[PDB]
From a paper:
TVV2 has an icosahedral, T = 2*, capsid comprised of 60 copies of the icosahedral asymmetric unit (a dimer of the two capsid shell protein [CSP] conformers, CSP-A and CSP-B), typical of icosahedral dsRNA virus capsids. Among totiviruses, the single capsid layer is responsible for protecting and sequestering the viral genome while facilitating RdRp activity and the egression of viral mRNA into the cytosol.
Subparticle reconstruction about the I5 vertices improved the resolution of the decameric complex to ∼3.6 Å by the same FSC criteria. Using the molecular modeling software Coot, and guided by secondary structural element predictions from Phyre2 (33), TVV2 CSP residues 37 to 700 were built into a single decamer subunit, denoted capsid shell protein conformer A (CSP-A), nearest the I5 vertex. CSP-A was used as a homology model for building residues 37 to 701 into the alternative subunit (CSP-B) situated further from the I5 vertices. Analysis by the Dali server indicated a root mean square deviation (rmsd) of 1.4 Å calculated between all 664 aligned Cα atoms (Z-score = 47.7) of the pair. Notably, we observe an unwinding of α4 and α15 from CSP-A to CSP-B to accommodate the interface with the adjacent CSP-A subunits. As noted in the planar view, channels spanning the width of the capsid shell are located at the I5 vertices. These I5 channels are lined with residues extending from loops between α3 to α4 and β7 to β8 within the apical domain. Closer inspection of the decamer model from the outside reveals the residues lysine 157, arginine 159, and asparagine 255 from all 5 CSP-As lining this channel. In the TVV2 CSP-A we observe positively charged residues (R74, K523, R525, K539, R646, and R653) arranged on the cleft exterior generating a positively charged region similar to that observed in ScV-L-A.
Numbering used by the authors:
A (entry chain B): 37 to 701
B (entry chain A), C (entry chain A): 37 to 700
């Protein structure tokens, strides 16, 4: 019993959303055109070490409006997307909910492992023949996360070509470092990486690279260690690339923050049937580019075999790991927080029994070889943040404002039309700000911003939907981020810890980036209607739609003429009620003031809004309420013409303007 | 005929309880993080000897809630799950009920030794079957208990690095100890270990170490000793690991207190065809860690062989040997009631015939290889007590009070409808405190609790449950602990002298720990809702249910707002409903303090209680009864909000919340 | 529900496949004729050492056709069936699937040795049944593999007379070899034999040669060793032939590479009632050919006795030991894909108990007595690969290509209807070549291929098929070979450095050799017509079928006339059939080169291909697709002639052409 819900569901059924394969196909293979620090210009030559956490590759995209009837031409705007590309952040949390993390099934690792432990094992420990005690939990997650981090290191070094280079292996290990200095990469204020040169662990009897080793032979003993066990044939253990891959994984695991390092120990250790190949501990210049690449390949093969050859969750965890160092940069001065509350993947210490003999499959294009995986991971994340944006805004702007002496019992005041009763909260400013998990959770549980999310994600990803959905929900539940009174100034990565202040002391907490990108990519988009082609506009009625609780963005008939001469086009007068009583009218802006209008007068000096061109803040709630207005016309015609807007962006996907939406017709 | 019990049984059948194997598997590789003393904090450098009997390994677990559609920030709480770490108690008692202790069948042992004797042409008297049956039955129980005790000593001495350790063996054999000094690993008030260096028995003719030895000679008379006989092949008697294991057990048995060295003699006799290797008592440091590890492995091999290759009863007894060192601590004021009443194991002196020529089953994951055997052993006990709590709190909170005018009036004198009429007991304080056994014995044997406890245990364990049920029934049926009126303060391990009296002098004898742990583990949970995720409270009805005796712990809205609202959201006024004489509404707290409510006032001015976030004492029995009360809200429709709760405990298992319950 | 598969199964059932025995019988007495190097020609005098790893024994086979009613003389072609002769590879891997390796039952061995021990009054411990079951299972697999390797070494050294031979034993024991020199029979780059003279183990107290010896004494303890025990009667331990055989095996086992001497220890222990004869290591020439022949015979007798008198599994393992020297070579450009993926045998270390008092079954025709064991062993492998090829090429040619724009587009991008949609794979060349295992594993496990491969193998072999099926499935499921883009040139044995890229970079991974051999042998043949006798072609329809993707090898008329006509017999013109817009007919070759056909022209000017008489590459996948083409003849009705083909191969068997097929 909800007409809007059923209408939207039927629409989404009519025009299925574009599954992610198109996004991957489009983004996989273009190099960035130019990379520069977010605020300013790049220097002549890049410094020795990435040290300013603002460098961001950007993706230009512009809009030009064009129409006859206006006084002068309209200047073009630059809707460009940015990618953080330097700053670090955590993404792994221990919390969980039912679907947040699942354990794989060792239904094809147990037969072989038992048949290989029954024969080559001293004939005095007894016959095992039970195939039921080999039931340790199967959680091969953290390996993929570390793999992703390693790929991220490689990509970050490639993009920001430093002046004096070093081999990726050399930079990662950091042989020629100082006592407690930062690694060659990731050396800045926010950097979180174990400093100092990496230390090889020890010179024990049974070594097989960085991890422990146990053999199964007659004149020996057998005792499976506690962590994970990767049972492999003697052929590969004595191979070369595999040893290098193990060393690389170990190396990237010891650069995590010390505390998080203690939480999730690197417990891998291999068991086979041949003599232990002593640890090699490469140093100075043993590993080189091609050898590293070969090791990466073999490692990917190993991980795929560990995942029961799933390759869709593998790519998921790999993306999530690579996301600690690449991520989209917000676009609105509000502060770019919608991402910060959706970035956590639950995890558990790795464990289980794994057997690896061959390949069992071949994937045409794995993530680790696609010409800068960082960008593709960042955009793969953005294509989800935008869907979340679309679902939250399904009802209204969902503002959160500040008022002094607000009741510390309930924080729900009605703001007027265009803001549904549920949303539109308020909070005292002089006390610590709210936690921002006290709103989102309340938003994504209702059976209107839930089913939409369900079906949209289902169409985007298909069978491997639940995992993402479940996980993101968990992220929302425990997010410590808080709302703040500051601005990002649109040329920063983080709020400058000075005294930026809000224009209206309020924050809209459901906008992350302009919906135009959502339309272009084909994903779901809401509210705001698309602007790419000829449009019939009726100012005399569009403006009316505005003052009764709209937003200017839908009203592309106004922005065109905002200061091109709208003045001598339309007048506003209080009301001409021919009967009961001649009362006067007024309107309320996003602030509290309720300045009124008494007589006929040109519109240009009653509202007088800032003119950006044809790209205004979509959820700014310019006017909340207004009663008693007429909007007379002051020119025959000249208020029922045409307008043409052209937007060309480099990320136009395959099915660009054929996606579901429910913006006013 | 009872409907509630039928409903509970049906629900339990439909939703099976979690198998024990998951709980075992999820602890094998748990790394502890806190080893602080229970009360204070770790000193800079660890001592040289385990003296303060207050240390505890703390399994931290955090819960924090949030008020959806509000700007309030409730501080996060802490589920402090404490495991006692240095304190000695006894879990052995020679008193058994019919099913308590079984007799492992010697079906596969007698024929092998018969054939051995026949092959080596030894002249024995009488068919070995009847002589085995009457002369020596087959009870190997003891030899597993000592093994568990040894593992526990190792684990204890490992976790608490005493600033200059020696070895497992050097702190066990008491080399360089004064004749009155206590062993290094256990030196504190009221310990349970004999002191001074242990003395090896005199070297007689034939010895296989610390126990007698008898060799079987061709064409020569053979007569068995009186204890237990462990026939072995000659290849093993000359092994170093075997003798080292034997020595370690002998040492562990001569360290338990003096009086139990004359009731459970460690009698054993190795029999083989070798030449008596003679005892080679290790004297100086000569038992290195790898040698001790090999000793433990071979020992577990022999033990598992003796138990007819069962590995389940063996695991049970090995664990029961460990609680003598590692115990699960209580989480309430008047604790040490459930654990103190379920620890004993019925036992018989070690005797019978055994045979070990080679191992047959390869146990993949024995106890002693876990990350820390103490923790694994303690958690299983915790599960047992959790289920026992679940069954006990099936029909109320089971209060016991100390009212001076106890004789003048009968029971149900003070406890209104809250405490189910039939589960409240009183006793005048002139006499000493009663014996807890009296109450628990009557509690357990009611058909309603029996028929459910049996099913729960059977689901948890399976074919091996009956031993555990019988043993716990015996233990609870045999307990000397008294319900002492004093308090524990929840910041100690042993009750300190001079502690203050309990709250209202009413001990509650069901609680041992919060049920959230039981929910997380996926085991049977009592009638408490699981604070897991999104909740939709309604403060009016919720509050009304409280004043009918219900537990505040089932009221989420109140706990969330305990000090952040409820002074501007809800009021209390007397009911003026009919035209009859107006009456002053009143409600009765636990101690019989009838409280009158004459003039309507904000709730926070009529009733109070400490704010523990959302973790309040489950069965605190706050309001016994109330009559004539009304609750009206004074907020413009924002008294029906939503809350979110997150419980990220580190001991969550596979069956997260799939376990049965009473009030879903 | 699948009709094609049902038809194939019905046809296979109606026409049984040839039993393996005929193939074995038709090779026992085959005399090879050519021993030239694969590439060049035999030098005047043979070398003194086997170095060039390119020699091959060539089984020549000739086919020549004739155009009935014509004066043309097509030159005779040559089915070059090459058998690699000096090249070492490994066919051992410790990785098994459930049916891969069985455990021969010790039903008839334990009782005999039990009775022997009882008769000789030896004091043993424990009934031998359970000790056999747990302490030592019965896997004699290894000792047959070494025997096969020894036979193979003999055969290799025999065929290639190295201009001054010494003996089987003098080239095996490495007498007079430098500490770095390699053994005479195997001295070349990337060999697989340990170098230098082999060193005898030290002479201890009791030895029956190169292995330990234990005698059973009346009224004396007896304890078995840890490896395998081979009880024998005293009459044999003192025999010369037995010890010579034992020495030969020991020598062969110490010559295989160093790293497999520590994973498959040659552990054995003779047990008897004699006096330890002591090791008598032959040192100078003292193993004459007749003595070695006797050694081999007695050895095969003992082996057959150990295998429960099976002689089928024994033959299989003996053969599998030989391919390590003799392999069947490929007959295509991108070969070494099928044989490289089906060679491994799952194995377990040698152990258990055995008993040999006298032979019981007299195998008439053992392997080692054949004219040349290498050839006989290689041919059986060839049969296995032939059947495997037959099953693989059941639904198309299974192409794999290297297109740079692989990611941008999905599969079926280039391969028209010719390559069954679902059997074409691509990969960008930026990454290294994929693993062949990935493709083959998916190929084999489809139900359609499984249900036919099983039946084919069962018909060929019988009760012993399941071992072979399981072992081949394991091997193919475990292969490290990569699909390297390079070419082989068909005039070598090992891929030479610097060879040119493949044709269109598209490897085809079904072909191993021409199906005419499979037809002749009477085994299952893929969907290729057998060019046997009189044929009645019709060039028009035949040519039309080609341009629908069919294989040119099924078009006899075209191949016969490839360069003798088809420039004056048939023309190609665009189809002008309807009144719609005329369109330029086009056809697409393998590499996606769309070819337009605008003006009608003689066929030889539109399409070309090399003339190999009538033996063209079977699955070359010439024309993927074509649309809008017409074929009209310009000869006065002499385009429907007859042809004759004669295939007088020297390895024809009884079931000449009675085997099943797909397109009869």
């Amino acid at each position: 019993s909800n007409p809007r819900l059923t209408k939207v569901l039927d629409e989404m059924s009519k025009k299925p959303c574009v599954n992610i394969n198109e996004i991957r196909k489009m983004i996989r293979n273009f190099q960035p055109q130019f990379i520069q620090p977010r605020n300013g210009n790049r220097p002549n030559a890049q410094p020795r070490t990435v040290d300013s956490f603002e460098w961001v590759v950007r993706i230009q995209s512009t809009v030009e409006t064009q129409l006859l009837g206006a006084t002068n031409t309209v200047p073009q705007q630059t809707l460009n997307l940015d990618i953080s590309f330097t700053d670090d952040s955590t993404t792994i949390t221990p919390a969980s909910i039912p679907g947040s993390i699942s354990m794989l099934d060792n239904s094809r690792h147990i037969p072989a492992i038992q048949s290989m432990i029954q024969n080559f094992k001293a004939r005095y420990l007894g016959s095992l023949q039970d195939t039921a005690q080999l039931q340790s939990p199967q959680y091969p997650q953290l390996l993929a996360y570390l793999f992703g981090q390693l790929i991220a290191i490689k990509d970050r070094l490639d993009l920001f070509r430093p002046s004096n280079p070093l081999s990726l292996a050399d930079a990662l290990f950091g042989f020629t470092l100082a006592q407690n200095a930062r690694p060659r990469y990731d050396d800045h204020r926010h950097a979180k990486a174990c400093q100092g040169p990496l230390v090889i662990p020890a010179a024990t009897n049974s070594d097989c690279g960085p991890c422990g080793f146990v053999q199964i032979n007659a004149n020996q003993g057998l005792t499976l260690p506690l962590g994970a066990c990767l049972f492999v044939n003697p052929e590969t253990v004595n191979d070369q690339s595999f040893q290098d891959f193990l060393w690389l994984i170990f190396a990237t695991h010891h650069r995590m923050p010390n505390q998080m390092q203690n939480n999730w120990p690197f417990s891998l250790n291999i068991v086979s049937t041949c003599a232990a190949p002593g640890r090699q501990a490469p140093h100075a210049g043993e590993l080189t580019d091609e050898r590293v690449r070969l090791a990466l390949d073999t490692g990917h093969r190993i991980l795929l075999s560990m995942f029961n050859d799933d390759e869709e969750t593998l790519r998921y965890y790999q993306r999530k790991g690579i996301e600690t160092m690449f991520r989209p940069c917000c676009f609105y001065t509000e502060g770019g927080l919608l991402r910060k509350a959706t970035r956590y993947v639950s995890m558990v210490p790795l464990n289980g029994l794994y057997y690896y003999n061959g390949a069992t499959s071949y994937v045409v294009s794995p993530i680790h070889t696609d010409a800068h995986p960082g960008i593709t991971a960042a955009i793969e994340s953005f294509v989800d943040i935008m869907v979340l944006q679309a679902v939250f805004s399904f009802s209204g702007p969902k503002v959160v404002a500040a008022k002094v002496n607000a009741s510390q019992i309930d924080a729900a005041m009605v703001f007027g039309p265009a803001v549904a009763e549920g949303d539109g909260f308020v909070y005292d400013p002089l006390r610590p700000a709210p936690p921002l998990s006290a709103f989102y959770t309340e938003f994504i549980h209702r059976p209107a911003e839930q089913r939409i999310f369900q079906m949209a994600m289902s169409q985007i990803y298909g069978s491997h939907a639940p995992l993402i959905i479940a996980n993101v929900i968990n992220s929302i539940h425990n997010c410590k981020t808080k709302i703040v009174n500051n601005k990002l100034r649109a040329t920063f990565v983080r709020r400058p810890p000075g005294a930026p202040h809000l224009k209206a002391d309020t924050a809209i907490i459901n906008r992350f980036h302009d919906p135009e990108l959502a339309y272009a990519l084909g994903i779901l988009a809401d509210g705001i209607a698309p602007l790419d082609g000829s449009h019939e506009y009726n100012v005399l009625d569009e403006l009316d739609y505005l003052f009764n609780g709209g937003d200017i963005r839908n009203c592309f008939g106004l922005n065109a003429l905002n200061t091109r001469g709208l003045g001598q086009i339309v007048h506003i007068r209080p009301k001409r009620e021919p009967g009961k009583r001649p009362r006067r009218g007024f309107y309320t802006t996003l602030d509290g003031q309720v300045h009124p209008v008494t007589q006929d007068a040109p519109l240009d000096e009653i509202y007088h809004w800032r003119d950006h061109g044809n790209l205004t803040r979509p959820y700014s709630c310019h006017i909340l309420d207004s009663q008693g207005l007429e909007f007379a016309d002051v020119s025959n015609g000249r208020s029922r013409g045409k307008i043409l807007v052209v937007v060309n962006s480099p990320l136009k996907t395959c099915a660009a303007y054929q996606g579901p939406s429910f913006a006013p017709k």
